[PDB]
Structure formats: C-alpha cells, structure tokens
C-alpha cells in the first residue's frame, strides 16, 4: 500500500501570506493525488483533483502542483476561513490511502 | 449490401461494445487486488484500446485472474475486428480487379 | 467441410496446446536464472497469452536463451493462427461476394 | 493501375502524413501535463512509429486525454495501413494464381 | 512452384537476414551513446525478433537515431513478411473453394 | 517535477586545471540535460546539449558526460573567461527544471 507522509503536521502562517502544504509518496504516482479540506466539526472537502485540477466553487486563492511522489497544495494570501486539517488522497493503486494531515495555524 | 462491409461494420460495433464492457469489468476485477492499477474507468478504457490494438504500452495491465481473462476477451476481439476489416479490404480488391480484367 | 474453417479450427486447438506446452517449458527454462521472474506456471500461462497476441504488456518475459526460443516459438504460432483466422475470413467474404454477383 | 496497388501507396502516403501530424500534435496535448514524456518531436516521431507498428516499446506513451485521442487515431491509421498492404499482396496472390490455373 | 509460396519462402528467408544486420547494425548505432541497452549481439538478435514479431517486452530499444531507424527496417520486414503469409494462406484457401465448389 | 541538484555551489579551481560542475536528478532522465554559461551581466549561454553534446561556437575545452541521474560538465585548463555562473536544465519530462547554479572561481 502506498504511503502518503504529510510534513510537517503544523503549519503557522502570518494573513495574507503565501502556505505550502507537503505530501510525498512512497513510491512514484503520476498525478494521481488529491487534496481535501477538513475543518472542526465539519467533513472533508475536495480542494484539488489530479494533484493540480481546480474544483468548481473552491476559492482561486487555492492550487495544487508536483506530479510522481512529492506534491505540493499552496494557498495564495492565507486567510482565516483557510483553518482546517488538510489531508492528501492517492488513486494510483488499490486501495487507496490517505495522508496524515496537516493542520494550518495562523 | 455487401456481406464484408456489413461484417465490418457490425465488428465496429461490437468492438466498441467490448471496449466499453472491457473497462467497467477490467474496473470491477482489479479493484481490491493490492498494488492493481487498472482501478479507475477513465485509463480503463485507455487500457482496453490498448489491449485491442495491441500497442500495449507497459502503463496498465491486470494483476487478476479475472482481469487478465476481460483482457483475453478484450485482445481476441480487437484483433479479430482488425482482421475482419484486413479481410473485407481484400475481399474489395479482389472483386475490383476481377472487374478490370473483365471476368 | 470447407478447408479455411478447419484449418482455423484446427489453428485454435494448435495454439491452445502450444500456449500451455510454452508456460511450462518457459518455467522448466527460466527456473535458476537469478533475476528471472517467468517462474510460476499461472503467471506463464499469462505470459503465453500476451506472446501469442503480441499484446506484451511488458509485465513478464523471458531472460535465457531458451526461454526466449520458448517465447519464439509462442509468438510465431500466436500470429500465423491470427493470421490463418484472417484468411479464412477473407475466403467466406470472397465466396459470398462472387455468389451475390451471380458468378 | 491496378487498385490495390494504387490503395496501397496512398495508405503508404496518408501513414506518413499522420506520423508527422500525430508527432506534432502529440507534443501539443501532452506539454502542460506534469511528469509527461511524450514532449519533444523527435523522440515523439520515433513514437508515433512505434505506434502505427504496435511495436510499442513502452519508453513513450501520452498521459492526457488528447494525447492518447491523437495516438487512437495513429494506432488505426497504421493498423488498417498494414493491413491494406496485407490485402493488396492477397489480391496480386489470387490473380497470379488464377492465370496459372488459366482461368 | 505458386506464386504466394515462393514469396512467403523467400520472405522468411528475407526477415532472417533482416533480424540478423539488424542485430549487427544496432549494435553499431546504439554503442556511443550512453545508457544505451542494445549493445551486445545476443540480446541484440532477441530484441530483432521482439521487433519483427511486434511483441515488443520493453525490455531492450534502441535510444539513438540511427538504432531507430534500422528498428523501422526490422518493423516493417516483420510484418509485411507475416503479412505475406497470411495473403499466401487466404489465396490458398480461395483456392481451395473455388476447387470445392466445382469452379 | 524533476529536481536538479548543483551541489557544490561554488568552485575554485587555479588557472590551467581541469575542473567538473556536478549535476545530479530526482529521476532518471536519460541523456536529456543541457549546460548553460551565464556571466556577470549577460544573458545564459547554451553550453552543451543532450548531456555530451557539442554546440558550434563553444571552444572545445567544454565537455560534458554522465546519464540517468549523475552528470558531468568538465572545463580542460580553465581560464579567466570561463568566470561564471552554471546551469543545467532537463527537457525529460514536462515541465522543463533548471539547477541552482553553480559558480566558478578561479
Ligand atoms: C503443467 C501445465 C502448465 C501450463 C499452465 C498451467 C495452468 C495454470 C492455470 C492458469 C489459471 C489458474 C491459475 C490460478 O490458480 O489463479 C491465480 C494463481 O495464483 C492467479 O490467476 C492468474 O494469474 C491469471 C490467470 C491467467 C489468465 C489468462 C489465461 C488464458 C486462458
Ligand atoms: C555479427 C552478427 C550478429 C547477429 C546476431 C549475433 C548472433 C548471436 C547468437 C544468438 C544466440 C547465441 C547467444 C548466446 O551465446 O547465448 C547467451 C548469450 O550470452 C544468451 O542467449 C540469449 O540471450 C537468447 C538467444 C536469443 C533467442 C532468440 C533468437 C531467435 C532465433
Ligand atoms: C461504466 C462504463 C465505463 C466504461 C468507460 C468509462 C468512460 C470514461 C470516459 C473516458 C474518457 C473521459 C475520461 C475523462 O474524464 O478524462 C480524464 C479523466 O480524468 C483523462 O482522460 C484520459 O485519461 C484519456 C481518455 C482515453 C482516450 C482513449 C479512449 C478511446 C475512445
Ligand atoms: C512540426 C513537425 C514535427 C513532426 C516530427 C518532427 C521531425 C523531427 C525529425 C525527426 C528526426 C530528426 C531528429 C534529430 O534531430 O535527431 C536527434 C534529436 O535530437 C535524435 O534522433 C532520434 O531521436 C531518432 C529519430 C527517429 C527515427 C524514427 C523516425 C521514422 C522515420
Ligand atoms: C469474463 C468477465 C467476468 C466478469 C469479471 C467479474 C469480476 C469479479 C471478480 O471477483
Ligand atoms: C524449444 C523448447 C526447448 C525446451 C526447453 C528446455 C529447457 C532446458 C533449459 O536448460
Ligand atoms: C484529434 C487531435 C486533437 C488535437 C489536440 C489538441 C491539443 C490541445 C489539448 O489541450
Ligand atoms: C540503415 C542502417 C544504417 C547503418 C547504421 C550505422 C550506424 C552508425 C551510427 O553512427
Ligand atoms: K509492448
Ligand atoms: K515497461
Ligand atoms: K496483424
Ligand atoms: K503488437
């Protein structure tokens, strides 16, 4: 099964500026990786698909780039409605499997 | 209309069909097979072109039995369609030219 | 009956032995190569499969000099009985278009 | 001339044209595509050869939809190419044959 | 002797002479770059026959230009040469009905 | 993203010595690397092409080697004009990367 590794779990951001979440597999996986937004309470939501493709009604403000095993989802001027874990989902190989998270703090 | 055209035509079909059916159940084969990547039916159908015109890239195959038997299926009908219209072609040229040499 | 579709019948049940006569001496010649993965007898049958419709998906393939004789001989049968079953078909077509001219 | 032979090297000429297109047009869907390789014209020429033969060594291949649409359309265009060659050689075969019947 | 056995002869003849300066020259081209695979004569031969047959492992392809274009020599002999056989079947089998049917 | 390593970033070599850039990536990437010279003030220099190939134009003190992963971009007798800053960029895979150079001292 491949693993996916989110480092660090705890991003500290100032507003307004730029984040970058990580997340690496295990082993190469195309583009296949996509990205969900958890906040407190609530369920996840789909951020990105195919490591870069935008998702209608998710703000500009967020992208999503690397292809193989690191990728890479950024958040342009980080704003406080963007507090969430954030969690990295991979659909190359059966079964799929989530990463670890990471939360972002401002 | 001529017997080959219409046979060509229907292995079109049917080949399509296949190629359709190929994916969903090449899907439903490999899914819970640890490390399968033939597991979503977009580059299922991918695979199943490549199956049946034999320009198997290395990308996608099947880990499974029962995949590898939907890939059987899937390669016996691509190329019996692609023979089947190698076939009708000749069948053509074979009566054209019977035609010119006037018999 | 008419010799085309023997001869394609034939071809079948030709290849049928020679795709499970080939998975078992391709394990009996790739056994003790170190590195060879063409070892097991499923995974061979497989192998004999994709070697006989030339859809080698790059997953499996021999690495002695008579494993690779094996897979030849594989690849030769699998596309001559293609081939005899094109030709076959070619023939019905030929027929059946020189009976619809009246000829 | 003859139709077949005609067929065959308009076939011959079309392949040609859809190789250069295929290259061409493969570069164009598969830049922008993360971790594609199929991205330079040459190595994308020697590509779409290996397409139009199904002798797909697996070093080239698309990853976008477009990409791999452009190699459907290389992948037939061959296939039937061949395959018309095949039944230009059937038909030439069967003509020879009837005069030495002297028929 | 027919037309279409003389010529699937000297076709099989032809594709070993073929495989043979094949595996010859692709070693000649392939030596010189680096990273190359195709660069020693067995292997050379195993990778001709992959080519002729179109059952392409993905194990050995040459990465230079003139590597490639003696592997277009080799693709197109391979199948015109199985191409042969089978238009060298289908006039055996025109035959043979024509005969069957009293013509 | 293939990640190109030019490490060290800097190199001191004395006058007339042969002298070797390094340039290493995340993945295999055949042959596909090309060599670039940028001097103070100007714009990057197309030293060599496809890991060894030569460019009309650049004096044949410049060579290069290396495939897959490790290349190698060697000066025989270094002069003063070779002063500069070095780039190796790949066009293996989509999108084309760039090292972070690698400055010669003399
Ligand atoms: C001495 C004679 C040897 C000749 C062949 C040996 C016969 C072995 C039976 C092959 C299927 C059963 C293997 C098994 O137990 O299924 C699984 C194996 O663990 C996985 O299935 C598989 O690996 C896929 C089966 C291959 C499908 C393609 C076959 C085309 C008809
Ligand atoms: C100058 C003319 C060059 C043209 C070809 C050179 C001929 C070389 C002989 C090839 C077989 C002997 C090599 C050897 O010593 O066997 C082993 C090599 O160490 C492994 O066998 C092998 O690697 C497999 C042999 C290839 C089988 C497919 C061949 C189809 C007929
Ligand atoms: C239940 C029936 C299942 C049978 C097949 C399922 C149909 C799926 C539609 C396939 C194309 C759309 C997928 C998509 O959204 O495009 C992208 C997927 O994210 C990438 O495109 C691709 O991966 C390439 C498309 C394949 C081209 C070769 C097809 C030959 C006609
Ligand atoms: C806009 C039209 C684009 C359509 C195709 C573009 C034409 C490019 C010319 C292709 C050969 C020259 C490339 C070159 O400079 O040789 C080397 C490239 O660096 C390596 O050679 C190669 O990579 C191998 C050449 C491919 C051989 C198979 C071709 C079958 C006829
Ligand atoms: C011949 C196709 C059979 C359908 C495959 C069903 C998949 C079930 C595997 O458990
Ligand atoms: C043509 C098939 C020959 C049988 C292979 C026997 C394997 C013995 C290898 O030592
Ligand atoms: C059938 C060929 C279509 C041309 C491909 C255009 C590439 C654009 C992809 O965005
Ligand atoms: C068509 C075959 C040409 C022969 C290849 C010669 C190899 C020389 C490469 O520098
Ligand atoms: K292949
Ligand atoms: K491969
Ligand atoms: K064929
Ligand atoms: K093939």
Redesign the interface.
């Given at each position: 099964?491949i693993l996916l590794t989110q480092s660090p779990a705890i991003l500290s951001v100032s507003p307004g500026e730029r984040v970058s979440f990580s997340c690496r597999a295990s082993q190469?996986i195309?583009?296949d990786i996509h990205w969900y937004q958890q906040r407190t309470n609530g369920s996840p939501r789909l951020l990105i698909k195919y490591?870069?493709e935008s998702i209608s009604g998710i703000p500009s403000r967020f992208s999503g780039?690397?292809?193989?095993t690191?990728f890479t989802l950024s958040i342009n001027s980080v704003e406080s409605e963007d507090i969430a874990n954030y969690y990295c989902q991979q659909?190359?190989?059966?079964?799929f499997t989530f990463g670890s998270g990471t939360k972002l703090e401002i | 209309s001529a017997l080959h055209w219409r046979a060509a035509g229907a292995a079109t079909v049917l080949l399509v069909i296949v190629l359709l059916a190929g994916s969903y159940l090449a899907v439903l084969a490999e899914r819970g097979a640890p490390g399968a990547q033939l597991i979503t039916y977009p580059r299922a159908l991918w695979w199943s072109v490549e199956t049946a015109t034999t320009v198997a890239y290395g990308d996608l195959y099947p880990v499974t039995l029962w995949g590898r038997c939907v890939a059987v299926v899937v390669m016996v009908a691509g190329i019996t369609s692609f023979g089947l219209v190698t076939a009708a072609l000749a069948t053509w040229f074979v009566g054209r030219e019977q035609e010119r040499r006037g018999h």
């Open positions: 099964d190469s195309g583009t490591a870069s780039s690397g292809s193989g690191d659909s190359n190989r059966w079964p | -």
